[PDB]
């Protein structure tokens, strides 16, 4: 059905009314989202059906119709934008300078922005409009604020 490049809402009618569980990126005929959003379950695009192709619970990522296509990376210096798609609200770009998640396996960028759970999977963009990761998997610090990682998959 709808294979157009762009950002999409992931919705369900299982709960009350229509509830938004997450967000995703459609690019090069592939739908990219966070694993915890869909749990690897199939998706519907009109009468079209999207089946999972690749997924990893540790990375918290999943691609539909084909392999992971996003590969741009945060340069560690520049400001980025979170293209946030909140439940029931219009897509909105928020510019921020990312922080750092120091792990034993290397440093990853971090975005300290607060959005409801249904915003999980919103893309993070560089100054060219290339998706450098997905927002929606992170931690909660001392002041109750949420810090998400900049999650990027590996392109083959």
């Amino acid at each position: 059905g709808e294979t157009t490049d762009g950002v999409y809402r992931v919705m369900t009618r299982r709960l009350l009314g229509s509830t938004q569980v997450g967000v995703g990126v459609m690019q090069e005929g592939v739908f990219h989202t966070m694993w915890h959003v869909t749990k690897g379950a199939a998706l519907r695009s009109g009468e079209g059906r999207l089946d999972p192709y690749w997924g990893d619970v540790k990375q918290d990522l999943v691609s539909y119709c084909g392999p992971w296509k996003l590969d741009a990376a945060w340069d560690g210096l520049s400001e980025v934008q979170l293209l946030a798609v909140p439940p029931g609200e219009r897509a909105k770009n928020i510019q921020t300078l990312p922080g750092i998640f120091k792990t034993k396996d290397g440093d990853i960028g971090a975005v300290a922005l607060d959005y409801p759970a249904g915003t999980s999977g919103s893309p993070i963009l560089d100054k060219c409009g290339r998706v450098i990761g997905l927002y929606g998997n992170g931690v909660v610090i001392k002041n109750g604020s949420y810090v998400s990682a900049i999650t990027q998959g590996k392109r083959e």
Binding site: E2, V7, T12, V57, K102
Partner: protein
């Protein structure tokens, strides 16, 4: 059963709301894809 609805183009918008800090945090990623604060 889940479904997708388009929400917009993927573009950088000049002059957008600039907010949020840049913290440097020590974190740990478990086998279940869960991050946690290391102190």
């Amino acid at each position: 059963d889940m479904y997708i609805e388009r929400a917009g183009d993927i573009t950088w918008e000049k002059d957008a709301e600039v907010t949020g800090n840049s913290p440097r945090l020590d974190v740990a990623l478990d086998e279940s894809g869960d991050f946690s604060l290391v102190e």
